[PDB]
């Protein structure tokens, strides 16, 4: 379980952790030897790690419409995947620490991510529904920082302190 | 000889294997690109067989041919140089004093009413035939 | 992880055939992109040195995510396949961008030692009048000398590219300085025998300027005292 | 060079010149000698010992 849970949470495809692109990655269905009850949790688990690769895709697009803020707002958020990759770290050494570890700890670690998590991917749905560029995003994102949540505002103020900087590219070169 | 030394120096490591085949390949890698330039000069000696000044046109062309990498071109430039340096001693014999000693013709000459032209070239300076003139 | 392996043997594959030991017709400033091309490849081989402790795959690929959007941009720039003063312009373009903060540097640090063997003919031809380019890629000029005419020294030098009529792709921008290091290059030899990419862009331009004035008021004295104009002028 | 120093014997053959000639070559000689004990030296108390 303990090696096998941090690479489903990175959102690679697993045997036991099918990809059917309809959903995302998701436990399969009723495994036996498998309690049913264990595995309802373990969906939502797996649920942090599809919004992830739903997350390196928004990325790998603009890196490696057309925009230079888009790739300055893919700088934004990797240090939102910072405290985020850092906790991968830490659950690791836990492991090492005992190899007999359940679970429960493990959900309890993620459970900081699970309002952290779906409020970025709602952000850059907004931003590639109504297919912005430049500057504009600055002030969508900073009613997004206007908002409610103390991680999240936090998250979204990094993600608008990196295309602020763009911004100043252009503003220290005019001015 | 200069390479030699730093070798024994990762032999006084080499004692015991603390060196794997990478780690001391890391260290031939800036030295990788100047041992081929050295090769290609001498190479390039050993085939046609020129003599004299013709030689060191011949280091002016691999100075030419290498262009970029400033660094290690900096170094054969130094030695096309050092090179023309038994080409300088013989080469104040014969304009500040005449009497001039080769030691098989490696500085063109030929000696001298009129008595003879007069043509020096044969061995061909290694930059423009004006001084060969002069 | 293993195609991240497969783009640093791609490096390799093009550092070892650009070497002009191998080639004499391909460009001096071609070779020139390799000699710090070569330098992050042994910055690769001390990390790979430091990879260990690796207690999961994910320590390293995740120390490798920062390399990773970096060697992706940096590896399919050569994918077209830009050669010579055309290859100066790609990573001039690239050098003006900056968006990624860690692809920034490293297309800056290029940028320092391919203009090497560029600016190397620049400087030469506007202080003696030697334009040293007779070998590889890129405008060769030993411009036809004429002693018959003495009328700029020269009645026939071409232009310093003779098809495009352009320089470009080095720090100013070449668009003024061009058409008059042209200029002052016929007669420096008339003399002679019978943060940002944009702020580092405006510290070269007055130098650029400063030595074609230089060179200037060189040959303005040269012309008051051989030519007599101004005794030309009252006869006419 | 060692038997060389050897056919110089006699001070008085034939030439002055003759014996000087490998008197330099006796001084050469001998510059040898004052390098093998410099490399010696390491071997023991009086690197990595390999030929």
Known sequence: ?175 | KEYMILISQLEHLQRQGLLSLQKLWFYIQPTLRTMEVLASIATSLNKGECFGGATLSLLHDRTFGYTGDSQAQELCLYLTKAASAPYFDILERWIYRGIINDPYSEFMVEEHWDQRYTIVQQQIPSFLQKVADK | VAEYGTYYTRLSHFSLLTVLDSSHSNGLVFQAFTSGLRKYLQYYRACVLSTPASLTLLTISFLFRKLGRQLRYLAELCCAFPTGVKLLSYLYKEALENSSNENYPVLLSLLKTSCEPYTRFIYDWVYSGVFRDVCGEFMIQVNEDYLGFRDKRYWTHGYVLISKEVEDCVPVFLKHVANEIYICGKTINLLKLCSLPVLMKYSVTAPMVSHVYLVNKAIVDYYFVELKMERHFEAM | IKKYTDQRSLDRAFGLVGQSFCAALHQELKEYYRLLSVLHSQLQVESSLTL
């Open chain 1, 1 to 175: 379980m303990i090696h096998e849970l941090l690479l489903a949470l990175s959102g690679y495809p697993g045997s036991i952790f099918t990809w059917n692109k309809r959903t995302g990655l998701q436990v399969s269905q009723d495994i036996p030897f498998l309690h049913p009850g264990e595995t309802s949790v373990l969906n939502r688990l797996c649920k942090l790690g599809t919004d992830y690769i739903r997350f390196t895709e928004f990325i790998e697009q603009y890196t490696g419409l057309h925009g230079i803020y888009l790739r300055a707002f893919c700088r934004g958020l990797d240090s939102i995947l910072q405290p985020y990759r850092q906790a991968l770290l830490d659950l690791e050494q836990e492991f090492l620490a005992d190899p007999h570890l359940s679970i429960s700890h493990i959900n309890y670690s993620l459970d900081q991510f699970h309002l952290l998590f779906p409020s970025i991917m709602v952000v850059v749905e907004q931003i590639k529904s109504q297919k912005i560029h430049g500057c504009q995003i600055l002030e969508t994102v900073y009613k997004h920082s206007c908002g409610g949540l103390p991680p999240v505002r936090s998250a979204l103020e990094k993600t608008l302190a990196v295309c602020h900087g763009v911004m100043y590219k252009q503003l220290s070169a005019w001015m």
